[model samples]
Target chain A: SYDNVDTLIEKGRYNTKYNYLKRMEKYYPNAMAYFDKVTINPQGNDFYINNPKVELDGEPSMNYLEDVYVGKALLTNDTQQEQKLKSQSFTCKNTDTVTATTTHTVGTSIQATAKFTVPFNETGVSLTTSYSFANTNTNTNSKEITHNVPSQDILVPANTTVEVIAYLKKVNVKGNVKLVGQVSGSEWGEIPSYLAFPRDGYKFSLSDTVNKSDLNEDGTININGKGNYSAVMGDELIVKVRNLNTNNVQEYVIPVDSNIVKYRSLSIKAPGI
Target chain B: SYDNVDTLIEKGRYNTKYNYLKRMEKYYPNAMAYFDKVTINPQGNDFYINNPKVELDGEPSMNYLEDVYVGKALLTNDTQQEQKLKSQSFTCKNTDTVTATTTHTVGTSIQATAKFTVPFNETGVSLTTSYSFANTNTNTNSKEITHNVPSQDILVPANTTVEVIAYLKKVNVKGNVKLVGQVSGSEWGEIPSYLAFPRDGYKFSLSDTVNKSDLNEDGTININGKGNYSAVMGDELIVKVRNLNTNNVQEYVIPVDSNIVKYRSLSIKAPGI
Candidate 1:
């Protein structure tokens, strides 16, 4: 008469000694013959005993009890989809960009570097650049750099061209520079005038005269050249100032003042100018 | 002497009341045993009805629960200890040091940097450096760099010093360079001599004339001065060159040829010489 109890005692072949199964066993002892076999191997029968069959006297017909009785359902609903968990999500928050810079005089080897950084636990980091003759416009060499540690270095031969390009792994590069070759002196009437590209990205370019208004309030060289002459975040401007009379080589970071409009070049007369 | 009722009931101090005992309250019959002195009511002996206790037989002196109940003891011997778990351990792997570097002629602000990197999730990282002038001995400037992100920069004033000292968290630094003031030209005349300190560690020292044979086979600057100049790991060399005649400024990295012993400076007539 009962569905689950009949299935346990008759078809399921569970032990009829169970309290709820007793009713089914009483009404159909021949159907309860499975209990005899169960008693023959009581060790296995203990499993069925712990999960006793249920025979409710009420109107409801279903009694779906989990055998363990102490855990969450391995799956939910009739679809039988297993439970799942989500792992942590990561983001590339290091937005700081590295700028490429150089310093040298004609007949002197180019001392060039591209500033770079790596986040914690970062892997497969690399940097690359190419150079050629500024006067003859002939391709000279290229360099690709990789590092197991945090930072790496690249090298370009001396007297190479003004045309240069650089690539950093994650950060986009801007303001790569192309310079016109000088036989006697710079277009600005100075010899060994320190040239700096003011931006992180680049182009085929022309040599324009930089004015004092193009400098910062402190007369430092403009790094981004948009009248912003000072050092910005990750701005490693290779400022090379040749003392024309003394043939002296000097260096500095121009404090940028983007606020100024009418440009002028500042002499290296002040501290950190 | 019995604190509980079992002993008293066994000793026959309690009894089932007869119908006459209730009637004794209404009439004066002699059916109440406890009311023998009163010959009236048995209600005063109801303490025996309030409590009835029974003891059961057991196997051992201890009532062991929740063990291998039929097996080992629920409690261990005094010498037996419980097992415990340990917490996970962490280590700091970003121990690479960024060396302090500089370039200048005379009265030019010192363009300087100290390389440093920290791993992700690292805390309390800092780097500091001291500087003094080669012409006049004095501690001109000091820079301290702190970072939560991976890499960071530091600054130094111009004409500060030719001598620098640095410290990284874990990496070993050596061969920090020292240079002298030049009024006319370098001690090694007209050579494409770019001196670089190969290692990270530094000291108070003098500038020595580096031999061409000391350079590598490719003609790149020998940073270590041990005849090996091809960008060993973690080598960021400060290269400076002076072009006297044209006074045009430029930059490049030479392929170090450490093999040539009869050192001669090449003219701009060569390609990647």
Candidate 2:
């Protein structure tokens, strides 16, 4: 029921080859020291691997070497609608060009119509206007006015105007993107999230493994040189994450494959004592 | 020596178009009403065009127009390097892939050798392990730990004993590149004295122009034809503001284009009693 440190009382000198094992023995009374619990399989008769530890020479690290396969990726939100609602909250410039064709063809008048939308109303943002004209061709003439959202056209007697509308078409969008596992909806609004990440979001795919090998560092296996190294295997996992508007409940999902195993670790490290 | 409002009055029709010109006349005394002030010059001028108040059908009235382009263009700010420092906070998935080769021959015993480096010094992290056979090979033979840092190299005394050394290899690292502009070292060091950008951190370009001329219910330009409209000249002294961060110093330079002249109001509006 119990083991004691005296179990290693007769152990020999531990060199660089056996230092870690000796240290383990000094700290652990049995082989279970490296495992979470002494578990045994009934029919198959095998013990689950313990939470593997990975070490890095830095602040954060990764652990557990097992590979994962992911699929059925999908974003869980409708981002377009969210942005549209936000857009109605403030004044914005909506400029489209109208070609000016007039009696006095001294130059092609480019109508620079500027409208200032008032803050939101129960219906929508109210609008106001001011305008100017410039010669798009010869760059000659121009005009300006504090337009009462013009009830009547600038009857240059007979003139036309045209231009393009270029501005950020969003209102009150806030926050940055981050990473996580599962996301819910109560927190993250129904904003459209992305699944096929552009090197930024999660990615997933499957490919034939071109090489395989085991027992490189944890333990040794005497392969009789008949072991193939380039033999490929199937399955892999890829995913990306974004902190949409800083919503915690929002999450996109990629289906996990059964053929591939999944593993994760909380990369904690010890200090240099 | 001073003139009174009644003495400065001139007879005018009830045309709403004339109200803006009237307002400008009082404010910019030297400004011409129609002919000269409204003239366009594409170069070296300072001008501003305020919009007429807008009222839409079935909506609460607002003095402000729903759209306003009250800023300049072609804005850029170079927060110098002395003001901030860059860090290498990066991720592996976003970087270039690394290729390593394991050497083995027809009759020679094949062994996998992997080496990665830790670029930065860490405080609280430890060595961890993982195994991946290049090209997906089913390797059941587990490896053992033989060497570790501050030294690099594994000690394998038995053919069956797999050895590994963590924190020994030099890793080719890529870091996140961001233009961090700041003056202090604290998290809230961004707090400015005044002004704040509620979202998008401000500093975005904006333009003022009307889409529905009827929205203002005034003598505004109607889309005789559809096309693109652009300001012939950029705004001068157009100050764009970013949402105030903690420092409240979020600001952007006003756009000034010598190619375009600025316009200011030359008159005021008043409906007869």
Candidate 3:
């Protein structure tokens, strides 16, 4: 029932002034001195006030002049010859069947030592011929004809189909060959004679270079390059590649981009094979 | 003194504006109707007064386009200074009177001509001598002492302190000497040779990065890359710049640089001749 202004805090503890003074002394000790100088007129006349100072020293100079030098005689083996595959062998499967009475050569034909009779439906039994030159003989179901037949032109019987699956697999086809000339004897000639292969065959080749102490220009000479090439029937595919001393041969495959085979000299033997 | 102040005009009057407007009134109802009723409106409700309708009837719209194209190519041929002296021919002045020492297989002897007068010296003296055997004279001077023959070397008395001075009055040097290895020579001599020349010669080379087509890849081929190397030599300076083209015989300095002639490969062929 009593309301008065003197009971505003209603407590015995008066911490306002004491707490303020403690905080002020902890944060700013100069507060007391300022108060004393302003209010009480302290005797001290000079106050050594200071603050932090920072500066950077200059950097040192550096000389960059250099004298010319007579370096040692460096010997290097930079003689490299590029090898390119002017031609390459190709493999294509000719699955198309020949249904005409054309003279053709097919797979090898052989008669059983005894009597190996064929089944009733064994009419066109698959066979492989290795460049044969023999005439045809009637088996239980079929007959075979080849370049070896007596007739210069092949003669297939009516309603009978003849097919040629052999390609010219022999001869020095890797090197240059005549456009229309013939060679009586070739190292690889024993494989085939009359028939010719549609695609070329590729054989790998390596460069045969030697190092010499003294060469044409009298400079230190060395042989330090190597590469591979493939021989083909038509235009042989040769290649010239970098043979940098770094021992690295990164082999990769890419889609056939071109069919051109450029030769140093023009020739018709393997023009665009 | 007073500074002038710039004044800007507010409007310009047209000649007989009323007369023109009156004339247009007869042809059309009112020219001010466009903005007065259709486009201008003080209150929002004014739109209901003249809600102008514009209809577009035509094909698809199009926009005008423009561009600046450069189709003409610039053609320029830079001029170059001559860098070398080519050919020099010295004619015999006193051909008949000149007595020559003809060294034959038999022995070295002197051939004397009647009334020989040295071009650089006095006129009435004659030199006469006989060689053990007659020999044909060669124009080329291989040894360092054989190039130029003053009156002293042939007929001037020994220890006579011959003051023979030959003046090069009609100095004529032209053309260029390009050496290339020909294929028609000996079979085993297929490689080309590089030799040391008079020290004052200059050498320039052209080189470029070979495209992939030029290497072991099957693709397009290019040769006109954009780079070259040039230099001069004197005082028996040996130069070895790498990555130079060896397939073609490139032309070098026609008139070499003066600095190169003064400081590079310019070796003294003789002591002080």
Candidate 4:
């Protein structure tokens, strides 16, 4: 019931069987050449062969030849493969205030920059890069940034900057307020003040609006046009009352007095121990 | 090139290569007998054979001898191992309120028993037997429980119990009131009353503290004279007031009168238009 060699070869060729057959041609030239004569039959379901012969050196080669098409082959020797470095260094600068640089290979790396013009005016930034190696056969060279991966060996520079200016601004500082009475609990409140500042680092003195002596070290201070002056504030007083009971009560008692006179004396005379 | 018989035998025995030679002696005695004549060579690097000869009944045996070895062989048989239970009944009891029990076997047979007990207020619990089995050869046979695996085979019994003594305490309750006033939001406060017993399945009546008319079903109450007559009290009249602000304002106006006649009559004439 098996098909002829010609028919099998023709069917195999249509399915790209020659790709694997070519690998075995050196060891089994006769067998590969035999299939070469295979021709398609338009009317018949099977193919026709002009020549047929089979030859292989020995059982070992024959076994290998069978595995080529049966697909059971395992290479005794493997290809030498390893990862290589793609890029050397990267540089990122933000105006004259910030700059970050580092070296890299085919792996992950980080770059961060911080700009300190003032306290509230400073900015911190960072970025992560993931580098991977690829084959050179494709159009693998291009400089594009997507997500965090870079298309080229080197990372592109990134910049972020800020401007400096000043004006009178309304500022609010929040602090904890502790009110003491029968019981104690803490509360939070914000105090408002007006000041001029070009940037956060700019310093100024306090006026009557904020008691210089009432401020903590980090708190506001009096300029006094003299020196750093600060102070602390005292706790506020609080009076609290729980509640009062107003329920009624009942009592049983007898009243005795000299005004009771004759009626009281008569009752006392009947008493026995 | 092949080493002489004497050199090969000496080298093979040092490497335990002669272990297979012993196995071959039973089937190929002539070959083993011929190697008995191997002699050592002192002046020459190669071994000296007084009588060199080789013989085997067939090519297969010769090939096997060659590999006894250039070293090549594999094991081809496996075990049809299996495990089965011998008994299925187990009993466990606790004088206290909880109990757990099970039975186990190996190659198949039951072990001894462990007893645990405790009065109404004690604890005694322990067990160390796996009611399961598996192949003894694979790393998988070790007793390991992962998220993907359950620790039961014929699940063992795990029992827990408690004493009975209580009234029908099928209590169900929840309450919240939103009273809004002048501005927007609202303030909420809860009235609290507390009582205790052996368990939550006891019942009683309300007192003046938690008014019967104001008892929010699930609310607290009562003091059974049979036991401690301690009832909880609650509060009423929540004087909750936010804040109030009231003020009035006036608009600019012109006042006309005869009092201005003498002093302003001339000026008013010019302002009439």
Write candidate 1's Cα lDDT for B130-235 as tens digits: 3222112222222232211111111112221111111112222222323222111111111111222111111111111233453333332211101000010111
CAPRI tier for the interface of model 1: incorrect
* lDDT on C-alpha atoms for all candidate structures: 0.21, 0.18, 0.18, 0.17
Number of clashing pairs per prediction, in order: 60, 116, 35, 7
Q: What share of the true interface contacts does candidate 3 keep?
A: 0.00
Candidate 4 Cα misplacement greater than 4 A, ranges: A1-273, B1-23, B26-122, B131-273
Q: For model 1, what is the error of residue B196's alpha carbon versus the real structure, in angstroms, after optimal superposition?
A: 76
How do all models score by TM-score?
0.14, 0.12, 0.09, 0.09
Tens-digit lDDT track of model 1 for A72-116: 111111223221221111112122323323221112222112222
lDDT of 3 by residue, B1-273 (tens): 111000110000111223333444666667334222222111111101011111111222222111111011111112232122111212222111222232221111211111111122111122222221213332211111111211111111112211111221111111111111100100011111112111111111111112233322222121110111111111111111111111111111111120112111221111011
Q: Give the DockQ (C-alpha) for candidate 3.
A: 0.00
- lDDT (Cα, tens digit) per residue for candidate 2, span B1-273: 111111011111112223434555775674333423232211211211122111111211111112223312221213321111111111111111222221111111111212222112111222222112112222221112121112111111211222111111111222111111101010111111222211111110001122232223332221110111111111111111221122121111211111112222111101110
The better-scoring model by TM-score among 2 and 4 is 2
The DockQ values of the predictions, listed in order, are 0.01, 0.01, 0.00, 0.00
- lDDT per residue as tens, model 4, B1-273: 111112122232222223333555776675345333322222212211111111111111000000000111111112232211111112111111122121111111111121221111101121122111111111111111111111111111122111111111011111111111111111122111112101111111212222355333433221100000111111011111111111111111011111011100111000001
Report the poorest 10 consecutive residues by lDDT, candidate 3 chain A: A177-186
Q: Count residue pairs with overlapping backbones in model 4.
A: 7
